[PDB]
Protein backbone atom coordinates (compact mmCIF):
# COMPACT_ATOMS: atom_id res chain seq x y z
CA UNK A 1 0.00 0.00 0.00
CA UNK A 2 1.29 3.44 -1.04
CA UNK A 3 1.53 5.93 1.83
CA UNK A 4 -0.25 8.85 0.16
CA UNK A 5 -1.52 11.89 2.08
CA UNK A 6 -5.04 10.42 1.91
CA UNK A 7 -3.86 6.99 3.16
CA UNK A 8 -2.11 8.79 6.02
CA UNK A 9 -5.37 10.57 6.97
CA UNK A 10 -7.45 7.39 6.65
CA UNK A 11 -4.96 5.63 8.94
CA UNK A 12 -5.24 8.40 11.55
CA UNK A 13 -9.06 8.29 11.34
CA UNK A 14 -9.01 4.55 12.07
CA UNK A 15 -6.53 4.65 14.98
CA UNK A 16 -8.13 7.78 16.48
CA UNK A 17 -11.20 5.67 17.40
CA UNK A 18 -9.30 2.57 18.62
CA UNK A 19 -8.66 1.44 22.19
CA UNK A 20 -4.86 1.24 22.06
CA UNK A 21 -4.34 0.63 25.80
CA UNK A 22 -3.26 -3.00 25.19
CA UNK A 23 -1.71 -3.01 21.68
CA UNK A 24 1.76 -4.36 20.91
CA UNK A 25 4.78 -2.05 21.30
CA UNK A 26 5.60 -2.62 17.62
CA UNK A 27 2.30 -0.99 16.60
CA UNK A 28 2.57 1.62 19.37
CA UNK A 29 6.01 2.59 17.99
CA UNK A 30 4.58 2.89 14.46
CA UNK A 31 1.71 5.04 15.80
CA UNK A 32 4.35 7.41 17.22
CA UNK A 33 5.91 7.59 13.74
CA UNK A 34 2.43 8.32 12.32
CA UNK A 35 2.11 11.20 14.81
CA UNK A 36 5.53 12.58 13.83
CA UNK A 37 4.85 12.42 10.09
CA UNK A 38 1.39 13.98 10.56
CA UNK A 39 2.87 16.78 12.71
CA UNK A 40 5.15 17.70 9.78
CA UNK A 41 2.07 18.07 7.52
CA UNK A 42 1.06 21.14 9.55
CA UNK A 43 2.70 24.52 9.00
CA UNK A 44 5.03 25.52 11.85
CA UNK A 45 2.66 28.43 12.50
CA UNK A 46 -0.08 25.96 13.60
CA UNK A 47 1.99 24.23 16.32
CA UNK A 48 0.91 26.75 18.97
CA UNK A 49 -2.77 26.05 18.14
CA UNK A 50 -2.07 22.29 18.13
CA UNK A 51 -0.54 22.64 21.62
CA UNK A 52 -3.48 24.78 22.81
CA UNK A 53 -6.04 22.24 21.56
CA UNK A 54 -4.04 19.38 23.12
CA UNK A 55 -4.04 21.03 26.57
CA UNK A 56 -7.76 21.73 26.28
CA UNK A 57 -8.73 18.19 25.24
CA UNK A 58 -6.63 16.36 27.85
CA UNK A 59 -7.51 18.90 30.55
CA UNK A 60 -3.85 19.79 31.19
CA UNK A 61 -2.89 23.01 32.98
CA UNK A 62 -1.24 25.98 31.25
CA UNK A 63 1.93 24.91 33.11
CA UNK A 64 2.17 22.21 30.40
CA UNK A 65 2.07 24.71 27.51
CA UNK A 66 5.87 24.98 27.20
CA UNK A 67 6.64 21.18 27.31
CA UNK A 68 3.74 20.10 25.04
CA UNK A 69 4.65 22.77 22.46
CA UNK A 70 8.31 21.68 22.60
CA UNK A 71 7.29 18.07 21.82
CA UNK A 72 5.39 19.27 18.74
CA UNK A 73 8.17 21.65 17.59
CA UNK A 74 10.93 19.04 17.96
CA UNK A 75 8.77 16.44 16.16
CA UNK A 76 8.11 19.02 13.42
CA UNK A 77 11.87 19.69 13.02
CA UNK A 78 12.94 16.09 13.73
CA UNK A 79 15.40 14.55 11.25
CA UNK A 80 16.37 10.87 11.18
CA UNK A 81 13.67 10.40 13.85
CA UNK A 82 16.29 11.19 16.52
CA UNK A 83 13.94 13.11 18.82
CA UNK A 84 11.07 10.70 18.09
CA UNK A 85 13.40 7.90 19.27
CA UNK A 86 14.33 9.81 22.44
CA UNK A 87 10.63 10.46 23.17
CA UNK A 88 9.90 6.72 22.86
CA UNK A 89 12.70 5.75 25.26
CA UNK A 90 12.24 8.47 27.88
CA UNK A 91 8.44 8.25 28.25
CA UNK A 92 6.48 5.37 29.76
CA UNK A 93 3.90 3.44 27.75
CA UNK A 94 0.72 5.04 29.17
CA UNK A 95 2.03 8.59 28.64
CA UNK A 96 2.75 7.87 24.96
CA UNK A 97 -0.71 6.29 24.56
CA UNK A 98 -2.55 9.37 25.87
CA UNK A 99 -0.35 11.73 23.82
CA UNK A 100 -0.89 9.71 20.63
CA UNK A 101 -4.66 9.34 21.16
CA UNK A 102 -4.92 13.10 21.77
CA UNK A 103 -2.94 14.13 18.68
CA UNK A 104 -4.71 11.75 16.25
CA UNK A 105 -8.09 13.18 17.32
CA UNK A 106 -6.86 16.80 17.19
CA UNK A 107 -4.96 16.46 13.90
CA UNK A 108 -8.04 15.52 11.85
CA UNK A 109 -9.93 18.66 13.00
CA UNK A 110 -7.29 21.44 12.87
CA UNK A 111 -6.30 23.34 9.67
CA UNK A 112 -2.84 22.58 8.25
CA UNK A 113 -2.25 26.27 7.32
CA UNK A 114 -2.59 29.57 9.22
CA UNK A 115 -1.45 32.21 6.67
CA UNK A 116 -4.52 34.40 6.03
CA UNK A 117 -3.61 35.01 2.37
CA UNK A 118 -3.13 31.27 1.73
CA UNK A 119 -6.28 30.27 3.64
CA UNK A 120 -8.39 33.02 2.03
CA UNK A 121 -7.34 31.87 -1.45
CA UNK A 122 -7.72 28.14 -0.76
CA UNK A 123 -11.25 28.74 0.58
CA UNK A 124 -12.24 29.97 -2.92
CA UNK A 125 -11.22 26.56 -4.35
CA UNK A 126 -13.03 24.35 -1.81
CA UNK A 127 -15.93 22.46 -3.51
CA UNK B 128 -14.61 26.32 5.65
CA UNK B 129 -11.70 24.71 7.46
CA UNK B 130 -8.50 24.04 5.48
CA UNK B 131 -7.70 20.65 7.02
CA UNK B 132 -5.43 18.06 5.39
CA UNK B 133 -8.52 16.20 4.15
CA UNK B 134 -10.12 19.38 2.75
CA UNK B 135 -6.83 20.09 0.95
CA UNK B 136 -6.88 16.61 -0.66
CA UNK B 137 -10.57 16.94 -1.61
CA UNK B 138 -9.87 20.32 -3.23
CA UNK B 139 -6.98 18.80 -5.22
CA UNK B 140 -9.11 15.81 -6.30
CA UNK B 141 -11.81 18.17 -7.60
CA UNK B 142 -9.56 20.61 -9.47
CA UNK B 143 -7.40 17.81 -10.91
CA UNK B 144 -10.39 16.78 -13.06
CA UNK B 145 -11.48 20.31 -14.05
CA UNK B 146 -10.61 21.85 -17.41
CA UNK B 147 -8.96 24.97 -15.98
CA UNK B 148 -8.62 26.65 -19.37
CA UNK B 149 -10.63 29.91 -19.44
CA UNK B 150 -10.86 30.16 -15.61
CA UNK B 151 -10.38 33.53 -13.91
CA UNK B 152 -6.88 34.67 -12.86
CA UNK B 153 -8.11 34.82 -9.24
CA UNK B 154 -8.76 31.06 -9.13
CA UNK B 155 -5.75 30.16 -11.31
CA UNK B 156 -3.60 32.05 -8.78
CA UNK B 157 -5.28 30.18 -5.92
CA UNK B 158 -4.53 26.87 -7.68
CA UNK B 159 -0.84 27.82 -7.76
CA UNK B 160 -1.10 28.40 -3.98
CA UNK B 161 -2.70 24.94 -3.66
CA UNK B 162 0.21 23.39 -5.58
CA UNK B 163 2.75 25.14 -3.31
CA UNK B 164 1.01 24.10 -0.09
CA UNK B 165 0.50 20.55 -1.42
CA UNK B 166 4.20 20.39 -2.40
CA UNK B 167 5.23 21.08 1.22
CA UNK B 168 3.13 18.08 2.36
CA UNK B 169 5.71 15.86 0.64
CA UNK B 170 8.98 14.96 2.35
CA UNK B 171 12.00 16.66 0.74
CA UNK B 172 13.17 13.15 -0.24
CA UNK B 173 10.11 12.70 -2.53
CA UNK B 174 10.72 15.81 -4.69
CA UNK B 175 12.94 13.80 -7.07
CA UNK B 176 10.15 11.25 -7.65
CA UNK B 177 7.59 14.07 -7.97
CA UNK B 178 9.81 15.61 -10.66
CA UNK B 179 10.30 12.29 -12.47
CA UNK B 180 6.57 11.49 -12.39
CA UNK B 181 5.83 15.01 -13.70
CA UNK B 182 8.17 14.62 -16.71
CA UNK B 183 6.77 11.22 -17.70
CA UNK B 184 3.13 12.36 -17.53
CA UNK B 185 3.75 15.43 -19.73
CA UNK B 186 6.16 13.55 -22.04
CA UNK B 187 9.20 15.71 -21.21
CA UNK B 188 12.80 14.55 -21.70
CA UNK B 189 15.30 14.16 -18.83
CA UNK B 190 16.84 17.46 -20.03
CA UNK B 191 13.85 19.11 -18.27
CA UNK B 192 14.48 17.31 -14.94
CA UNK B 193 16.72 20.05 -13.54
CA UNK B 194 14.31 23.00 -14.26
CA UNK B 195 11.21 21.06 -13.09
CA UNK B 196 12.93 19.83 -9.90
CA UNK B 197 14.13 23.40 -9.18
CA UNK B 198 10.49 24.57 -9.23
CA UNK B 199 9.42 21.85 -6.76
CA UNK B 200 12.46 22.46 -4.52
CA UNK B 201 11.85 26.23 -4.38
CA UNK B 202 8.10 25.75 -3.79
CA UNK B 203 9.03 23.32 -1.00
CA UNK B 204 11.43 25.78 0.68
CA UNK B 205 9.37 28.90 -0.13
CA UNK B 206 8.65 31.39 2.67
CA UNK B 207 6.07 34.18 2.44
CA UNK B 208 5.10 33.01 -1.08
CA UNK B 209 8.17 34.82 -2.48
CA UNK B 210 9.07 32.26 -5.17
CA UNK B 211 5.39 31.40 -5.72
CA UNK B 212 4.76 35.05 -6.65
CA UNK B 213 7.80 35.12 -8.98
CA UNK B 214 6.43 32.07 -10.85
CA UNK B 215 3.16 33.90 -11.51
CA UNK B 216 5.03 36.93 -12.91
CA UNK B 217 7.66 35.03 -14.91
CA UNK B 218 5.50 32.26 -16.41
CA UNK B 219 2.73 32.51 -19.03
CA UNK B 220 -0.77 31.11 -18.39
CA UNK B 221 -0.40 27.94 -20.48
CA UNK B 222 2.97 27.01 -18.92
CA UNK B 223 1.35 27.61 -15.52
CA UNK B 224 -1.90 25.78 -16.38
CA UNK B 225 -0.02 22.73 -17.72
CA UNK B 226 2.15 22.62 -14.58
CA UNK B 227 -0.85 22.89 -12.21
CA UNK B 228 -2.87 20.23 -14.05
CA UNK B 229 0.21 17.97 -14.08
CA UNK B 230 0.89 18.39 -10.35
CA UNK B 231 -2.69 18.03 -9.06
CA UNK B 232 -2.98 14.66 -10.86
CA UNK B 233 0.39 13.11 -9.89
CA UNK B 234 0.34 14.45 -6.31
CA UNK B 235 -2.72 12.39 -5.31
CA UNK B 236 -1.07 9.11 -6.40
CA UNK B 237 2.52 9.44 -5.07
CA UNK B 238 3.63 8.67 -1.46
CA UNK B 239 4.39 11.66 0.79
CA UNK B 240 7.13 9.68 2.60
CA UNK B 241 10.11 7.75 1.18
CA UNK B 242 12.04 6.64 4.30
CA UNK B 243 11.77 2.83 4.19
CA UNK B 244 11.72 2.63 8.01
CA UNK B 245 8.81 5.12 8.14
CA UNK B 246 6.94 3.46 5.26
CA UNK B 247 7.47 -0.05 6.67
CA UNK B 248 6.04 1.00 10.06
CA UNK B 249 3.10 3.01 8.65
CA UNK B 250 2.22 0.04 6.39
CA UNK B 251 1.47 -2.09 9.49
CA UNK B 252 -1.17 0.47 10.57
CA UNK B 253 -3.14 0.82 7.31
CA UNK B 254 -6.70 -0.66 7.63
Ligand SMILES: CCCCCC/C=C/CCCCCCCCCc1cccc(O)c1C(=O)O
Pocket residue numbers: 067090091092095
Ligand atom coordinates in the same frame (compact mmCIF):
# COMPACT_ATOMS: atom_id res chain seq x y z
C1 LIG C 1 2.20 6.24 40.94
C2 LIG C 1 3.21 7.34 41.18
C3 LIG C 1 2.61 8.62 41.73
C4 LIG C 1 1.80 9.42 40.72
C5 LIG C 1 1.40 10.81 41.20
C6 LIG C 1 2.55 11.74 41.49
C7 LIG C 1 3.57 11.79 40.39
C8 LIG C 1 3.55 12.59 39.37
C9 LIG C 1 4.28 12.36 38.08
C10 LIG C 1 4.05 10.98 37.51
C11 LIG C 1 3.77 10.95 36.01
C12 LIG C 1 2.33 11.26 35.63
C13 LIG C 1 2.19 12.25 34.49
C14 LIG C 1 2.61 13.67 34.84
C15 LIG C 1 3.86 14.15 34.13
C16 LIG C 1 3.60 14.95 32.85
C17 LIG C 1 4.09 14.27 31.58
C18 LIG C 1 5.59 14.05 31.53
C19 LIG C 1 6.42 15.18 31.58
C20 LIG C 1 7.80 15.07 31.52
C21 LIG C 1 8.39 13.83 31.40
C22 LIG C 1 7.60 12.68 31.33
O1 LIG C 1 8.23 11.48 31.20
C23 LIG C 1 6.20 12.77 31.38
C24 LIG C 1 5.36 11.49 31.31
O2 LIG C 1 5.94 10.42 31.03
O3 LIG C 1 4.16 11.56 31.58
Ligand SMILES: CCCCCC/C=C\CCCCCCCCCc1cccc(O)c1C(=O)O
Pocket residue numbers: 067070071086087090
Ligand atom coordinates in the same frame (compact mmCIF):
# COMPACT_ATOMS: atom_id res chain seq x y z
C1 LIG D 1 20.31 6.18 24.22
C2 LIG D 1 21.28 7.30 23.92
C3 LIG D 1 20.66 8.68 24.01
C4 LIG D 1 21.64 9.80 24.33
C5 LIG D 1 22.29 10.43 23.10
C6 LIG D 1 22.92 11.79 23.35
C7 LIG D 1 22.06 12.74 24.14
C8 LIG D 1 20.86 13.16 23.81
C9 LIG D 1 20.02 12.68 22.66
C10 LIG D 1 18.84 13.58 22.34
C11 LIG D 1 17.98 13.96 23.54
C12 LIG D 1 17.68 12.81 24.49
C13 LIG D 1 16.51 13.06 25.41
C14 LIG D 1 16.61 14.34 26.24
C15 LIG D 1 15.98 15.58 25.59
C16 LIG D 1 14.63 15.35 24.92
C17 LIG D 1 13.57 14.69 25.80
C18 LIG D 1 12.33 15.55 26.03
C19 LIG D 1 11.32 15.49 25.08
C20 LIG D 1 10.18 16.27 25.19
C21 LIG D 1 10.04 17.14 26.24
C22 LIG D 1 11.04 17.25 27.20
O1 LIG D 1 10.83 18.11 28.24
C23 LIG D 1 12.21 16.47 27.10
C24 LIG D 1 13.28 16.59 28.18
O2 LIG D 1 13.34 17.65 28.83
O3 LIG D 1 14.06 15.64 28.33
Ligand SMILES: [Cl-]
Pocket residue numbers: none
Ligand atom coordinates in the same frame (compact mmCIF):
# COMPACT_ATOMS: atom_id res chain seq x y z
CL1 LIG E 1 9.84 15.21 28.96
Ligand SMILES: [Cl-]
Pocket residue numbers: 092
Ligand atom coordinates in the same frame (compact mmCIF):
# COMPACT_ATOMS: atom_id res chain seq x y z
CL1 LIG F 1 6.44 9.26 34.94
Ligand SMILES: [Cl-]
Pocket residue numbers: 152
Ligand atom coordinates in the same frame (compact mmCIF):
# COMPACT_ATOMS: atom_id res chain seq x y z
CL1 LIG G 1 -4.26 40.02 -13.97
